[PDB]
Every structure is written in structure tokens, then in C-alpha cells.
């Protein structure tokens, strides 16, 4: 019994985005699929459910608003995909969305999708830029103006892994991410070592490799 | 209408901790790993979900209900909650106890490289300390800075049970050059009185 999300996703604001959610491996008519979302830093908030025998989500025309939950069913009847539309979309919106399975009548979720993020932004497409961060002490690499996330942080190629923390991403009001990566090591050994953090942003097939 | 107490717990590797929600109902706790999709443990209110180990156990009195996680494991870290239908308590973070440790802290200066694009970023890392709570203070030629400032903290760390935060204090060019002395300021709960690292121009 499974369920499988889309990939995440990007939009700029006003426009509309689908979340994916496919289900796998019971009798699928059986039980509501209800969607949830999460926001950075926040506890669960429920979306909505849909019945997957007749297509009909909790809130009639007359109250969805701007959340649309949808079915086709994969006639084997062993497939359904199931989609939550949002038109319209604002920074509000920005969130990890979950798929998830009502098990029995009273609202118990045994299954869950990995969940997908969509992340309403007003810019576009942009590798980063990285900067060193200069002197036990400590030394990094500041990966600046960025978008959209992810980045990969490595150093000397993978071969340095101990003392390494690569940040979570913050956003600035640049409306673009900035993300620190560091490492520690003895006072000594500087002038021994080639210290060399190794970005990369695949939406942009930018792959700096930049030296402390 | 519900509530959940308390919003942070540390615990020690086998200890037993307890979480109570305030609610009315066919009640459901899950645990959220940081980075995760939910998972159930309890179902109505005690009933224990397939597959989920004995040492959690979920008691109902009244408008009561603890999760109860006995024999505490490393691999519990994580945030708890509690739902009825629609409505989902935002809950309690869960991490490791371990011997207090005050932070490594470390200043950085911007790069010149970066100069040269007109924006100047000041960093500043705590490195290692526990427990998580933490407060930085950005402080230039003794001025308090007041807005400009993003804070970023690690996961617990799943070797020495620390947590680390970077400290990026963001001004342009002009606005820079124009003060002498950056001092970066934390106080922590491991540190017997607030420590500051602080440079300016001798290289
Ligand atoms: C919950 O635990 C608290 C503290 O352990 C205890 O006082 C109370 O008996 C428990 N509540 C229920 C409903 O078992």
C-alpha cells in the first residue's frame, strides 16, 4: 500500500501549479485520499479530501476557492493518480504538500506521501555564487544568490567529510537563497592542506569549485 | 479544543518521556522526522500501529491523552503530534540530552571578492553546543543592528549530539567601509557569560 509524490515544483506568483500523488497496491476505491500541507517551520494544515470512486472532494463548487482536488483512475482499478491543483498561487502557497490515506472512518493516516514542494517565488532561474570564508579553527564557503534550491556542498571532492556542516538555505529579501557551508580543523595544517568546496546547482548547470 | 505540552523535550538514550494533548475524539499521534513524511504510532487514542515498537503506548483519560515512548532510542529524535479529523496540534521536538557544551564561536569578514558585487556579508558561527537554545547578537563599533540578519541552525548531529547555527548579518558596500570594529556577541545557556569574537581592519 503506497503512495508516490511528484517532484517539487516552482511558479511564479499567479499563476497555477498540480501536485501528483500516485496510489498503488490495495483496493484504492476504498479510502478517502485526503491532502495536507506544511509550511517552513509549521504543524500540519489539512487541504482537503477526494473520493477516489466518485471524484468528489469535501468542498462543493461553491466552496473550493482556489484548491482543486482531482482522480483518473488507472482503469485496472490497481493505478489511480490523484491531483491537487492551486490557481493563482502566492507566497502563502509555499509548502511541502502531502498526499496521505484515511484509513478507517474516524481520520487515522497509516500511509503518507513523501510530500512535494512547491515554492511560489517571484524570480527565476539563477546559479549561485560562492565566496570563501577565511580564518583548532574554522574556514567555509558562502554559497550566495541562488536559485532555485538545491546546491550541493562538498569538499576536496568528497574526500573531506569531518567537521563539515552545509547549512539549511535562508532567504533574503533579495527574494533569492544564501547557504553557508563549514568546516573545523586544527590551527595547524592550513598551509599543509588545499581546502576546496566544491558547488553545484543542477537547475542551472553552474559548478563552481572554489579554494580557502 | 486542543493543546500539546511541552513544545521541547530533550531526553537521555533509555530514559522514558511523555507527551499530553488536551482533546475531544478519535485521537492519532505520529512522528515527524525533520525533513519527513509522517508516521503513525497510536491510533485511537491506545491502540498500538502494526509494526511500531511495544515501548510506545498511548493512554486516554478524559480529555487527556499521553504518548508515552519508554526505553527511549536514538532513533526517536523527532517531532511528536497529536490530530482529531481536521485538526493537528503543531507539536513537540524531541532531541538527545547530552553534557552541555557552549558553542565554538567564529567571526568572518567579508570576502573582497564579494566587495566587488557591491553587497558585504558578515557570518558568524556557533559551532557544537547543546542544548539548542541560542542567541546571537551582531554588534559594529558598538551599534545594535536591529534588522539585516538571516539565522540558520543545524539537525541535532547524529555522532556528538550537538547543533550548530550560522549567523549571516547582510550590508552594502558603502555602509560597511564606514565603521571600524564587528564584534559578534552570543549568550548561551553553557556559557558562563555572554563571549564575543570581534575584528576589524589589521589583518
Ligand atoms: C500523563 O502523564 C502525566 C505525567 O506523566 C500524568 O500525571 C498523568 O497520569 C498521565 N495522563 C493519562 C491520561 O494517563
Known amino acids: 500500500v503506497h503512495l508516490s509524490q511528484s517532484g517539487a515544483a516552482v511558479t511564479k506568483p499567479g499563476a497555477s501549479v498540480r501536485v501528483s500523488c500516485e496510489a498503488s497496491?490495495?483496493?484504492?476505491?476504498?479510502?478517502?485520499i485526503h491532502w495536507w500541507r506544511q509550511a517552513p517551520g509549521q504543524g500540519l494544515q489539512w487541504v482537503g479530501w477526494?473520493?477516489?470512486?466518485?471524484?468528489?472532494?469535501?468542498?462543493?463548487?461553491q466552496f473550493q476557492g482556489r484548491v482543486s482536488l482531482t482522480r483518473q483512475a488507472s482503469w485496472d482499478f490497481d493505478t489511480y493518480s490523484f491531483y491537487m491543483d492551486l490557481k493563482a498561487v502566492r507566497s502563502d502557497d509555499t509548502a511541502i504538500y502531502f498526499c496521505?490515506?484515511?484509513?478507517?472512518?474516524?481520520?487515522?493516516?497509516?500511509?503518507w506521501g513523501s510530500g512535494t514542494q512547491v515554492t511560489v517565488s517571484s524570480a527565476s532561474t539563477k546559479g549561485p555564487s560562492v565566496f570563501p570564508l577565511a580564518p583548532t579553527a574554522a574556514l567555509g564557503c558562502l554559497v550566495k544568490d541562488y536559485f532555485p534550491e538545491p546546491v550541493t556542498v562538498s569538499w576536496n571532492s568528497g574526500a573531506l567529510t569531518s567537521g563539515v556542516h552545509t547549512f539549511p538555505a535562508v532567504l533574503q529579501s533579495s527574494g533569492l537563497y544564501s547557504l553557508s557551508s563549514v568546516v573545523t580543523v586544527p590551527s595547524s595544517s592550513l598551509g599543509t592542506q588545499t581546502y576546496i568546496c566544491n558547488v553545484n546547482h543542477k537547475p542551472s548547470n553552474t559548478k563552481v569549485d572554489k579554494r580557502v | 479544543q486542543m493543546t500539546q505540552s511541552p513544545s521541547s523535550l530533550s531526553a537521555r538514550v533509555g530514559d522514558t518521556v511523555t507527551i499530553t494533548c488536551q482533546a475531544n475524539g478519535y485521537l492519532n499521534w505520529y512522528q515527524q522526522r525533520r525533513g519527513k513524511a509522517p508516521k503513525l504510532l497510536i491510533y485511537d487514542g491506545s491502540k498500538l500501529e502494526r509494526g511500531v515498537p511495544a515501548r510506545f503506548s498511548g493512554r486516554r483519560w478524559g480529555q487527556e491523552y499521553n504518548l508515552t515512548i519508554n526505553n527511549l532510542q536514538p532513533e526517536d529524535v523527532a517531532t511528536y503530534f497529536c490530530q482529531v479529523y481536521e485538526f493537528i496540534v503543531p507539536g513537540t521536538r524531541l532531541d538527545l540530552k547530552r553534557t552541555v557544551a557552549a558553542p565554538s564561536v567564529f567571526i568572518f569578514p567579508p570576502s573582497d571578492e564579494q566587495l566587488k558585487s557591491g553587497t558585504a556579508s558578515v557570518v558568524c558561527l556557533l559551532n557544537n553546543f547543546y542544548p539548542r537554545e541560542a542567541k546571537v547578537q551582531w554588534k559594529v563599533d558598538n551599534a545594535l543592528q536591529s534588522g539585516n540578519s538571516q539565522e540558520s541552525v543545524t539537525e541535532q548531529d547524529s555522532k556528538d549530539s550537538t547543533y550548530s547555527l550560522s549567523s549571516t548579518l547582510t550590508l552594502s558596500k558603502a555602509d560597511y567601509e564606514k565603521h571600524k570594529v564587528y564584534a559578534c556577541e552570543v549568550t548561551h545557556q553553557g556559557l558562563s557569560s555572554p563571549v564575543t569574537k570581534s575584528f576589524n581592519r589589521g589583518e
Open positions: 496521505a490515506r484515511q484509513r478507517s472512518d474516524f481520520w487515522d493516516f497509516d500511509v
Open positions: 497496491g490495495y483496493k484504492i476505491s476504498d479510502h478517502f
Open positions: 477526494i473520493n477516489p470512486k466518485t471524484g468528489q472532494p469535501n468542498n462543493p463548487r
